[model samples]
Target chain A: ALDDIDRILVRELAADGRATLSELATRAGLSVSAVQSRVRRLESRGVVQGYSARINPEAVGHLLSAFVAITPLDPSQPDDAPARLEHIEEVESCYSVAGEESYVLLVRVASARALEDLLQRIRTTANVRTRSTIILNTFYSDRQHIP
Target chain B: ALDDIDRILVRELAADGRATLSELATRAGLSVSAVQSRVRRLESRGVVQGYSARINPEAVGHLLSAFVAITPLDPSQPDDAPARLEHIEEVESCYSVAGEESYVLLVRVASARALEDLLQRIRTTANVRTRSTIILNTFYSDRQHIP
Candidate 1:
């Protein structure tokens, strides 16, 4: 149902969700009401999910970060592992994965010490084995793509 | 200069970036102008990097997702690799990492067949060797945690 105009609007919204309708209208070559109505329609159709502020984790007391490969010991009982991982708030992302790794996770903590302890906590949970790699420097992350 | 108030403000903004001043004021226990001013200050300080729309990748045409570990063929020539990788449109997040891997990336594409082609394109690039784990099911990603 979306055309080029909708794609452009969505891309702009993705780059800066706070952008005003008037500003979008200027670029979109439509009336303020026109752009506003289209955006509303897109939202109604569920093309635009929601907006968020991207904040640096280091500034908010979480300095260390890593990706963990998680494999459950008893592969037959897969459902329980996700529920158990839910208890660990440090597990920011829990992805049940293909390839040799069962799950890939992104975790953030205050320090290397905390990361070690958090990994230990995850390891102690029944049936989960974790292999983690530390994030040294992030070049660029979360580049927006409308397509 | 971020106090508890600022932290709470930032956290709430991450949850709903488009929340109106009045709503933020009600929760933050600050006046509309005060809340607005603090947000401005945070922006000036770059604590608030930018706003983004959290659209589901599948809804936007990407279905498959993976985390890739990238290593350059000539290990000594590592600095230029990030710049080279910037050309690859499929790479969503590129992180230079430690513990036996140089770069770890998060990729989202249209299909598994496309994913297979993408990794080949990446591997074929000069000075690049890649190892990837495909994500089968995403439990949760980009959780708004003010850690």
Candidate 2:
């Protein structure tokens, strides 16, 4: 549902979320106030969402990251699962989706033992039927299709 | 092994990879030629890597993003695991460390089905012994550190 202007704004912002209003205006070829107003509108509409600081995970000593897939006993029951996931510190993000797996989580742990402990906790507390994968390298990140 | 000047160049390029030498010099408060020579040196030293267009995966329909953790059958294998991980197309980045899992992967798939297919491939092909969580919401994707 994004128009040309909105698409341009999103592309510029996606590349550098911290770009100033003036800088974004220049990139999008719009007046500063116009760009500012559109950005505000986009935020309110839930299209732009919010701003964030992309940190280097390695710098913070969270040297390990992984994904965990979970299938809840009751796929229809979403309330308790969210609360249980929120309780885990290492569980950075969780999502419920339509698929063989009901939930997916992004997790970071300091050590291997910590990862195992977290998994054990999920298995016991969430009663999760689960599977997981660890990544070794990356070809790219933050990939966008802006012409 | 980057000096202060080299770090500045890297940070500037991280902000806008397509920025010309003149623009980078202006931002870094250095002469255009000086910036050029420094960039060349950085490239030669393999510190600067290469220029790339950072794209948004969501825009391109890579809607499902997750992190995967992999534990090798033999943890004592050589450190070439990181290099080996680079070959997987779905993998955006990989890191090896002193943690519960030997490596962590940032991965993406076009949809939930694609994610399942990717995971199944990893499960069987890699002979991965163990795996863990896949993150759903990304509260932050740090980009402010570029400055």
Candidate 3:
């Protein structure tokens, strides 16, 4: 369980993953050393996982994004499915869900032809009975007109 | 161009979108009035776009995420493609690229059936001819690694 200070840190990091320790310390009303120690603790505990650059897919020419659902032939299959998924570089993320669909995926690609090829690969290699949806818009929290 | 103070403010707000003016002032090492003035200036200049919550899509059952490549029938088609794409509710983002494919998309869906329905809609409405790969895993950034 995260304490108040840890919660503040989580919120701070979630907003801007690039904030510096000194900057975070200043914002959280904590000393630099204190913030540093807390961060170290978070990492040691595996709570603070890793960092990444939030690349604007648009700027990078990655225009399309979607979610693909996969259902394995056998529901009783072991974690091998996830391991197999990891072999595919295009797969940005995957998750096991509690539903008819065994896995969910996040992918990025260059073109629709590429998407078709990708789907084909999944169908062949993973034996996936797949379905996908294209994202239209991302309604971020800030975009909402909450009273 | 973002200045030193503006960077500080933006970083602060990015970390905590709901940070108060007084809090922002303290974090940025500026007076409350100065911070307020600069924030307004940033907003007016479009540097600080808006405040929003970074939601965890998984919490809302949008457990699947992916990227797709959408190639328009004709790459030479006018900029109308983007406008037309914007009209689609499922397309979270669309971009024109200089590559084998004309566009890329990010999408999310509730289930496999919904995903299939969405893809069918895109294929028919967007006139997408080809597609590529889909991603399945999302490795979110950790706060400790931001600096």
Candidate 4:
């Protein structure tokens, strides 16, 4: 369980993962050593997971992005799909949600041709069919959920 | 827009945004100063956006997440919706895609009551009707796109 201080630290790290020990200390109103210990507590326990950097898809090989609504051919066969989907690099994010679709995927690819090829692969993946929407422009994407 | 070396630098940062200058230099096969200039070029040219940390929502206050597919009430009414939607803190990511829905939003909130409040607010916002799917489980999410 998290208190006010832990919540503040989580929000700070969400905003800037590379925030230094001093920065975190100053913002959380704790000493540097104190902040360090709390962060350790969060990570060492189940409170906070690993630290990772976010990337811009445009700068990388993926110039195009889209989300595909995945429907499994047989609703009963669900166990094997996620692992197979995870093996595909283009599918950067996947979420199983309460909806008509079994899962939704955020995918990034190099171009129209590449997107089509990847979609083809996804469609023929044996147990699933996908309908995709190619992102035209992103007004604001990759925003942080800071509590 | 990126050359071979710049791609490598972004790749390195995506792997470890907190990597030291020397680590970047060695991984990118450039001198420390050369890596510095390349980084500046990437940053100034807007090819490289700022880096940030990824947080696990389950551990934080944001224990619930969902995606809302938003359709505009009127085709002519365009510019106001994003600003209004953005005003709500729970609206973390917004994207414009080519589909029946005008925009898809990734949202995070604390509880069922909060989620309903946020969704009701969004539904009553300027000119959009939203269809939401609460995420039941996340296999993997917010993975950085590596070149």
Best-performing candidate as measured by lDDT: 1
User: How many clashing pairs does model 1 include?
Assistant: 0
In the range B53-141, model 4's lDDT, one tens digit per residue, is 66667776788888888987777754567788878888888888786888888889999989989888898884688888999888887
Q: What is the lDDT of residue A29 in candidate 1?
A: 84
Residue B122 miss distance in model 2 (angstroms): 15
In model 1, state the lDDT of residue A38. 88
Local accuracy of candidate 1 as per-residue lDDT tens digits, B39-74: 999888878888987766776788888888888777
Stretches > 4 Å off in candidate 2: A74-79, A97-99, B1-147
lDDT of 2 at B41: 73
Query: Number of clashing pairs, model 3?
Result: 53
Measured over the true interface residues after superposition, the C-alpha RMSD of each candidate is: 1.6, 7.4, 9.3, 2.0
Chain A TM-score of each model, in the order shown? Answer: 0.86, 0.84, 0.84, 0.89
Worst 10 residues of 2 chain A by lDDT: A51-60
> Which parts of model 4 have CA positions greater than 4 angstroms off?
A76-78
Candidates, ranked, lDDT: 1, 4, 2, 3
Question: In DockQ terms, which candidate is top?
Answer: 1
Q: Chain B TM-score of all predictions, in order?
A: 0.89, 0.78, 0.85, 0.91
> All models, DockQ values?
0.73, 0.11, 0.06, 0.65
- List the candidate 1 regions with Cα displacement exceeding 4 Å: B124-126
lDDT of each: 0.83, 0.64, 0.60, 0.79
Residue B105 lDDT (model 3): 63
Ranking by DockQ: 1, 4, 2, 3
